[PDB]
Write a protein that binds this DNA or RNA. Structure first.
Lengths: 180, 148, 83, 94, 260
RNA sequence: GCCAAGCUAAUACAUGAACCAACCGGGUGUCUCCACUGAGACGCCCAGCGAAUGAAUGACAGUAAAACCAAUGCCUGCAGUAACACCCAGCAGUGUUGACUCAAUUCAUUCCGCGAAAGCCGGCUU
RNA sequence: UGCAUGCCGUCCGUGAUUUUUUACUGUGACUAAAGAAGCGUGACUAAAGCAGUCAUGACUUGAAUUAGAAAG
């Protein structure tokens, strides 16, 4: 089947390698997952040593983290907006590592209100928490609009998950200009 | 911070994997002299980290001082032969080989492809020290450690 | 009933061979729980909790040693300043 | 072994004022309260001799809110005074 | 997936003749390495002559009559190695496995008191789950709470009956060691200095009791005592002193003449 | 090389164990007290191994005398001083390597693989 | 469980300061057997082999040692 050996490649001299052995199972490759956006569907794959790889065919939910607050939430995925490999992957809505997506922002708004007492009991730890703390205008604008941009940090074709992190800082401005 | 146009020349954002640059209360462990957060490490075999690694702004995975590439195996010396490729050079090692039947020597040489980090700026004819690492491309197995 | 003995109600088969006494064949009963078996099971739980209890005790002795050696150094320092 | 000072636990400094402790104390006691361990409280009676207030009540009874324990403190107020004299010289010496 | 061992490929120290069989017993994985062990069948059939062949060796071993480190071993391919304690209670024999001055395996007789302990060399230190420090030994032991002063070069005195550590000996400048590998295997010396070459093999310089100098790699030295006169283990007869080849031959000739 | 029906084992397959039984932490509601906030109950959650993502730790080792605020510790003003508001007054302030984004630990969210074989013998009612 | 505590040259880690290799040569380390060299041994000799020798066992039996390109 698919192989990952260097035998079929040319030498740096341009010469041709003469192969004198058959293909071995220890150097195989497999067909790509091509994970899409939709209702969950996965397929297990028995890998070397007896361990199992989870090949995701379709996903629509994931675990996304707000790095500044060091928290995370489970949210629904809405769209694929950008991809550095090619925009034909955006057209088909393919999920891969390091692609930019838009997720639901409602759970993050609820956590903000319950942790800081801010809408975007006697013990007021909120006053202590808001001290020397501020939020970026770029994030708050999206939190009010309903959707917020994020970056996939997992490999869906290897683990069956679509986890990620919200975009902040200069990386957010980089992708906003590329989408403008 | 703002976007550095002198660095972001690719379709994807360039960043270091080890640290997070968007931190409101950065830790002094990875704080650079110019405020910002930068990851750098000390490689082992009595080599010194260049000042551009600690205080620069270049992003380079496959750099032994600012990424997860580690040095283990052989340490060699050679002269710089070509610098036409991007972030990689060709070095030459010249040596004498002994023939037993005719009790005499003959000149021989070998060529190697070496990854060069933006911390160094070698020129053709210079001498460098290189160290073995994991395979980085079809031909590259070494990294530049010092320029003489 | 639940407490009735089941060994008595097992089906026996009679085998007749010429010039020999009759053969009675009955199966060996499986999953018959006896007091010997009941004691064997209960011992397994008792020793599992015992092994874990011993491991916690070993941890306490190690932490006692680390703290004791740490306090002697600062006690010695205070002794030098006092004299 | 008979000692002047006696140890009181687990009184809490932020929840009780200074006036509350001598309400339980019989009298002639000098009070000191500690915050590194909240429970700590040292009572040096003027004429303790046989500590009747310590042998009685103590573990048997309970303070406000929580049960209490008392033990002989094996601390002499004279030695503290001796250190106080040396300390005042040190403050003057500097 | 190798499971055979040709006789010509077997270690020379086993002393198996080339003409009396094509194969040799292949040791199983276990406490010691394949190239640095001595299988139980070789101990019981060769060396000691309690068994005349492999059939009689199996009869003895599978009854549980041979104890290694206070435990019955029933496999003739079990790998036994340096500093192991072997006891056969029915016969009443106790030995320790060591190296003689010529580098060969030697069985040293032990008293009942001396059979309760063995020396263990640390090879690694790591932290297990729950923040538990673990020390890995040259014979595959894992000690769950070593002394806080333990280092990778040190030696641990281990009581095998109670399964408890008793003492620790550190690898220092003034300690006595024995060489476990290389050309100097079996020699007993005293450390003079250790050379550190980061990334490569450290080199140890040693001094024999007779003043002779020799060196080995740092991974081939085994601490056995605080000086050449206070050893915590019993060593073979020659006391780890290499003898001149010319001199050794001359004495052997004289002894033969007097004996006859 | 094969089909259908009827019987029946498990160390095959599936399911499944409360109290005995601990230490430690995170988030939150009703009671007491202080001061004009702080402390302690009480409730209420949730905290195993392993896997995934995110946030911290994974040390220090280029200079020295002293003021001023608010909060704290200890003495009756700055001596004395591992840390910590009681049950534990020393129950980790200290992993390894030449080198690590490694070992291990805490926090947030998420898996949706993990029997004490529900096992078998023997010696003496256990 | 303080059951505790006291009666000049060096060692080790980290920063600052500036520089000499290669080659040849002497030692040393690390380097499977079988094969080659050779120490001992009256398998009746020898080609061999690693054994055996002597007075309820001993020899605390023996099985020594060397050379093997170049590169590291």
């Amino acid at each position: 089947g698919i192989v990952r050996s260097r035998l079929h490649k040319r030498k740096i001299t341009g010469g041709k390698t003469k192969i004198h052995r058959k293909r071995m199972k220890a150097e195989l490759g497999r067909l790509p997952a091509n994970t899409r956006l939709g209702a969950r569907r996965v397929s297990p794959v028995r890998a070397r040593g007896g361990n199992f790889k989870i090949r995701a065919l379709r996903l629509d939910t994931g675990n996304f983290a707000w790095a500044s607050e060091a928290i995370a939430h489970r949210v629904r995925l809405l769209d694929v907006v950008y991809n550095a490999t090619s925009n034909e992957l955006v057209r088909t809505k393919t999920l891969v590592k390091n692609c930019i997506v838009a997720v639901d922002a409602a759970p993050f708004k609820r956590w903000y209100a319950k942790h800081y007492g801010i809408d975007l009991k006697l013990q007021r730890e909120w006053t202590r928490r808001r001290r020397n703390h501020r939020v970026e205008k770029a994030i708050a604008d999206q939190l009010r609009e309903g959707r917020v941009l994020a970056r996939i940090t997992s490999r869906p074709g290897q683990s069956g998950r679509a986890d990620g992190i919200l975009l902040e800082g200069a990386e957010l401005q980089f992708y906003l200009k590329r989408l403008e | 911070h703002a976007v550095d146009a002198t660095i972001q020349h690719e379709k994807a954002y360039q960043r270091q994997t080890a640290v997070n640059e968007n931190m409101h209360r950065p830790s002094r462990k990875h704080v650079n002299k110019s405020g910002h957060i930068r990851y750098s490490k000390k490689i082992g075999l009595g080599f010194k980290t260049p000042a551009k690694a600690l205080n620069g702004k270049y992003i380079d995975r496959k750099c032994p001082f600012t990424s997860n590439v580690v040095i283990r195996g052989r340490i060699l010396r050679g002269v710089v032969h070509s610098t036409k490729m991007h972030r990689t050079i060709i070095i030459r090692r010249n040596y004498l080989h002994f023939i037993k039947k005719y009790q005499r020597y003959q000149k021989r040489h070998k060529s190697l492809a070496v990854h060069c980090s933006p911390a160094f700026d070698p020129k053709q004819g210079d001498e460098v020290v290189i160290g073995q690492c994991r395979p980085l491309s079809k031909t590259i197995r070494y990294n530049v450690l010092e320029v003489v | 009933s639940r407490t009735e003995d089941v060994r008595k109600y097992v089906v026996r088969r009679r085998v007749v061979k010429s010039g020999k006494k009759d053969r009675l064949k009955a199966p060996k009963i499986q999953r018959l729980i006896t007091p010997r078996v009941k004691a064997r099971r209960a011992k397994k739980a008792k020793d599992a909790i015992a092994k874990v209890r011993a491991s916690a005790a070993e941890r306490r002795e190690y932490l006692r040693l680390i703290a004791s050696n740490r306090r002697a150094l600062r006690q010695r320092d205070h002794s030098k300043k006092h004299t | 072994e008979n000692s002047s000072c006696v140890f009181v636990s687990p009184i809490f400094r932020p929840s009780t004022t200074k006036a509350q402790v001598m309400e339980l104390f019989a009298g002639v006691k000098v009070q000191r309260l500690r915050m590194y361990r909240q429970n700590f409280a040292y009572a040096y009676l003027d004429s303790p001799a046989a500590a009747k207030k310590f042998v009685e009540e103590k573990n048997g009874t309970e303070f406000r809110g929580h049960t209490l324990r008392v033990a002989l403190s094996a601390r002499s107020l004279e030695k503290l005074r001796a250190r106080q004299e040396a300390a005042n010289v040190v403050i003057a010496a500097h | 997936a190798k499971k055979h061992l040709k006789r010509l490929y077997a270690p020379k120290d086993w002393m198996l003749s080339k003409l009396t069989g094509v194969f040799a017993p292949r040791p199983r994985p276990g406490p010691h390495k394949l190239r640095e062990c001595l299988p139980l069948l070789v101990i019981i059939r060769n060396r000691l002559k309690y068994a005349l062949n492999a059939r009689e060796g199996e009869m003895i071993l599978r009854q549980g009559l041979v104890h290694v480190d206070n435990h019955p071993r029933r496999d003739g391919k079990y790998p036994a190695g340096f500093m192991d304690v072997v006891e056969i209670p029915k016969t009443g024999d106790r030995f320790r496995l060591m190296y003689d001055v010529k580098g060969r395996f030697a069985l040293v007789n032990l008293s009942e008191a001396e059979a309760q302990i063995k020396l263990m060399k640390v090879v690694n230190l790591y932290t297990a789950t729950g923040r538990v420090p673990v020390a890995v030994t040259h014979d595959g032991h894992r000690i769950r709470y070593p002394d806080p002063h333990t280092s990778i070069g040190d030696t641990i005195v281990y009581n095998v009956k109670e399964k408890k550590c008793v003492d620790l000996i550190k690898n220092r400048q003034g300690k006595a060691v024995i060489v476990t590998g290389g050309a100097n295997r079996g020699r007993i010396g005293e450390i003079v200095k250790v050379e550190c070459h980061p990334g490569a093999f450290n080199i140890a310089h040693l001094k024999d009791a007779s003043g002779a100098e020799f060196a080995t790699r740092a991974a081939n030295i085994f601490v056995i005592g605080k000086d050449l006169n206070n050893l915590q283990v019993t060593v073979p007869k020659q006391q780890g002193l290499r003898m001149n080849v010319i001199q050794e031959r001359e004495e052997r000739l004289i002894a033969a003449e007097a004996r006859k």
